[PDB]
Amino acid sequence: MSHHWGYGKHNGPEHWHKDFPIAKGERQSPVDIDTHTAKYDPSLKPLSVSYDQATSLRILNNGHAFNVEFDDSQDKAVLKGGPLDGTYRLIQFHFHWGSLDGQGSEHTVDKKKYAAELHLVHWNTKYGDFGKAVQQPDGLAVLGIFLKVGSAKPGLQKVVDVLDSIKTKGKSADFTNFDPRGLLPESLDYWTYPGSLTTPPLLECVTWIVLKEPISVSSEQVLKFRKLNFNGEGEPEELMVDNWRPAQPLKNRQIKASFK
Ligand SMILES: [Zn+2]
């Protein structure tokens, strides 16, 4: 249908509440991280990211972003520790980005926007599969990583290089042997809060873990994101930029951190 959700003026974040009333709920994401009001919790443990046996499959343009999909049939790529009481399996990653380097991230830090934000999405092994997990308040754990512009990120290059092949909605490419360790910063210091999916259906099923340290990507690398299209092949060109939801009200949730 013509007014399927998206990021345009007619179908974007300001409109989502009409089909998805939880958009105005109590635990929506993303949020602004005010570093004066976030609370250092010395009891927060280190994150445990185990990606050395991750098995990537394919990369696809779904008309909203591009997703790299993983084999989540075993404990090959798991997130645990940190604020988490369970183990979560990686199913996909994707990014959100802007029409210029000055915006594109979903989370903000003291109102500062980054050029992009990477989401690694993981689901809780208590629940059987992803579809079941998103119905539970502790169903998902999303690791959020900001992108700033500087030096190139070597581990991102395979992704950048393939994007020309999946320009339009519905296109995919094989994408094997991709190592998601190559997308992580040196430090795993983090903020965490309870929240939601940032796209429809906006379900309030996510433990967010947002890394303090951005990764650096080159200007050339993030520029390639902006060549993707929201549209299908043959349809009028609608460039895939500004596929981010703005910050939502915190509503008395506590953001906790592993540092001051
Ligand atoms: Zn996302």
Which technique was used to obtain these atomic coordinates? X-ray
Q: Confirm whether 83 is domain-assigned.
A: yes
Deposited resolution, Å: 1.5
Q: Confirm whether 6 is domain-assigned.
A: no
Query: Taking Cα atoms as reference points, which of 139, 172, 153, 174 lies closest to residue 216?
Result: 153
Q: Confirm whether 5 is domain-assigned.
A: no
How remote is the CA of residue 43 from the centroid of ligand 1, in Å? 28
How remote is the CA of residue 64 from the centroid of ligand 1, in Å? 10
Q: Confirm whether 8 is domain-assigned.
A: no
Q: Confirm whether 223 is domain-assigned.
A: yes
1: which residues sit within 8 A by CB, 6+ positions away?
Answer: none
Write down the residue that tokens 């070597």 correspond to.
Answer: 154
Rounded to 5°, the CA angle 146-83-35 comes to 50
Write down the residue that tokens 């802007």 correspond to.
Answer: 98
**Could you list the active site residues?**
64
Query: Taking Cα atoms as reference points, which of 51, 131, 45, 60 lies closest to residue 89?
Result: 51
Q: Confirm whether 1 is domain-assigned.
A: no
- Domain residue limits at 82: 13-257
How remote is the CA of residue 94 from the centroid of ligand 1, in Å? 6
How far apart are alpha carbons 66 and 171 in whole angstroms? 10
The binding site for Zn(2+) comprises 94, 96, 119
CB 58 within 8 A of CB 69: yes
Q: Confirm whether 62 is domain-assigned.
A: yes
CB atoms < 10 A from the CB of 142, how many?
A: 23
Beta-ladder partners of 56: 70
Spell out a b/e string for 116-141, using b for 16 or more CB atoms within 10 Å of the CB, else e: bbbbbbbbbbebeebeebbeeebbbb
- Tell me the Cα Rg of the chain: 17
CB atoms < 10 A from the CB of 156, how many?
A: 21
The binding site for substrate comprises 198-199
Give the total number of structural domains in the chain: 1
The binding site comprises 94, 96, 119, 198-199
How remote is the CA of residue 104 from the centroid of ligand 1, in Å? 11
CB 96 within 8 A of CB 64: no
For residue 178, count CB atoms less than 10 angstroms from its CB and return exposed for 0-12, middle for 13-18, buried for 19 or more: buried
Q: Give the domain CATH number at 86.
A: 3.10.200.10
Q: Confirm whether 2 is domain-assigned.
A: no
